[PDB]
């Protein structure tokens, strides 16, 4: 299967 | 690879699924199952309802494969916003062909997320399709030569 984009993750709570 | 994908109760994105590790709740109609992640581990697993919120692997869209996207249709988008990028249901409201370039296609999709309702025009690098749109690549043949 093809690669999916990296996911980037954040907290919130700006 | 990776089969199936699913939904997280965290935060409504869909993520590669490693492994079915259980299931419940057959009897209801309405089963559930025990996932654990790609990328993730034991922490991160999550019971998740079968019916609805896992699913065939999105496909990655590259080239003339931008033919099987269509006003209308569920894809699965990667959504970049200012600190998190992550990949989500949306809709595609509106597909513009373009030239296609030695780099592939240029095609731009006018897509609203479901969860948000948000708009964003994206490249076919952030589309993902359903395997259920992949009869299109034989009807629309002349349409992926043309590009
Ligand atoms: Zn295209």
Same mark, same amino acid.
């Given at each position: 299967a093809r690669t999916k984009q990296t996911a980037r993750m954040?907290?919130?709570?700006? | 690879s990776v089969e199936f994908e699913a939904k997280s109760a965290r935060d409504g994105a869909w993520y590669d699924?490693?492994?079915? *590790?259980?299931?419940? #709740?057959?009897?209801?109609?309405?089963?559930?199952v025990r996932v654990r992640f790609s990328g993730f581990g034991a922490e991160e697993d999550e019971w998740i309802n079968v019916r609805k919120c896992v699913r065939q692997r999105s496909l990655p869209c590259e080239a003339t494969e931008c033919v099987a996207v *269509?006003?209308?249709? #569920?894809?699965?988008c990667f959504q970049e916003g200012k600190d998190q990028a992550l990949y989500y249901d949306a809709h595609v409201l509106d597909a513009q062909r373009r030239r296609h370039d030695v780099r592939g296609c240029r095609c731009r999709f006018l897509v609203?997320?479901?969860?948000?309702?948000?708009?964003?025009?994206?490249?076919?690098?952030?589309?993902?399709?359903?395997?259920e749109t992949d009869y299109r690549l034989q009807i629309l043949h002349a349409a992926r030569a043309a590009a």
């Open positions: 954040s907290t919130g709570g700006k | 699924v490693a492994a079915f *590790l259980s299931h419940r #709740l057959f009897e209801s109609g309405d089963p559930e *269509l006003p209308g249709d #569920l894809i699965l609203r997320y479901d969860h948000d309702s948000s708009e964003e025009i994206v490249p076919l690098r952030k589309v993902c399709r359903r395997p």
